[PDB]
């Protein structure tokens, strides 16, 4: 599956100094994030229940499963050896996609 590229390896914009990356996670689609001094990630919306009451997001480092519900739209995701990221999502029912605010300030390269 081919992923839609968001960000650049030579740029720090959107990942440093209280800034975030806005992503649109399509069902049966993939999104790839790139940043200076940060590991390359793969964001994918795996499962969506009828509602949409439950959104399954899988984060894979170049996976870890995160659950997004209307009650709990924001979650801190731990990626062992790579630090953390925050998925501040906007669930607006079964539209086939999920809009997320990704905060990659606490992310780091393993080495």
């Amino acid at each position: 599956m081919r992923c839609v590229g968001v960000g650049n390896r030579d740029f720090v914009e959107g990942v440093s100094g209280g800034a975030w990356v806005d992503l649109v996670l399509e069902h049966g689609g993939c999104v790839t994030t790139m940043a200076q001094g940060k590991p390359t990630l793969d964001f994918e919306l795996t499962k969506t229940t009828a509602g949409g009451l439950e959104y399954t997001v899988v984060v894979t480092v170049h996976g870890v499963t995160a659950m997004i519900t209307p009650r709990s739209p924001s979650v801190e995701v731990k990626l062992p050896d790579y630090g953390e990221l925050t998925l501040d999502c906007e669930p607006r029912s079964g539209t086939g996609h999920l809009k997320c605010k990704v905060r990659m300030e606490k992310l780091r390269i393993k080495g």
Partner: antibody
Amino acid sequence: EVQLLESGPGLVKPSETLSLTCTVSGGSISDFYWSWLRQSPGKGLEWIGYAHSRVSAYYNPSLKSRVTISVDTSKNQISLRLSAVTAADTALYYCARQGTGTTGVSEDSFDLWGQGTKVIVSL
Amino acid sequence: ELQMTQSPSSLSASVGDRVTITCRASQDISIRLNWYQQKPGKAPKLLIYDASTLESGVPSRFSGSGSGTDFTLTISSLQPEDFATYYCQQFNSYPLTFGGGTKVEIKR
């Protein structure tokens, strides 16, 4: 104000499953990462693993095949399940909050701890 | 797993003395190290995080230093309540590992 109350049997027979409960008081269980640790006078302080209500759990590779840590939002409690138990699993078990960038004191530090539960594996 | 070595295992000291607890890592862990205090019958209590940052409520006598592999915990002037077992914990790589601990006993 968030408090951790530890529960479970003090004596477990060998080959059985070790079940312990950590109840959260005066706060929301959903917002934090919950960890389980153990201490013995020869193996020292050992990190078993962590669990989150909406994020997939991560365990120590030395216990991964036998350990399960679950977060129950409705019951407001965290459970620790250790199968195929032996005398080597006899330790003082602790339930703690694993800090993040916004929650706890700092990322991957244990600020809030349980009272501790003495678990003896014997027939 | 990432091995953490604490030296000495046992330390005999007097009240008012300057005590230094060492913690050595097998790999470079940057400043990703935390310090804990454990008294008999009680759970471990966090003192210092991020190698040098002091936790709120912890007295000024407790100090943290080091980067990479070599790390130190310093109690400038030892108080009667400070007699406990001190542990160092890394968080650079998983699984999260703790040191063997340093038991601070009263010299006589």
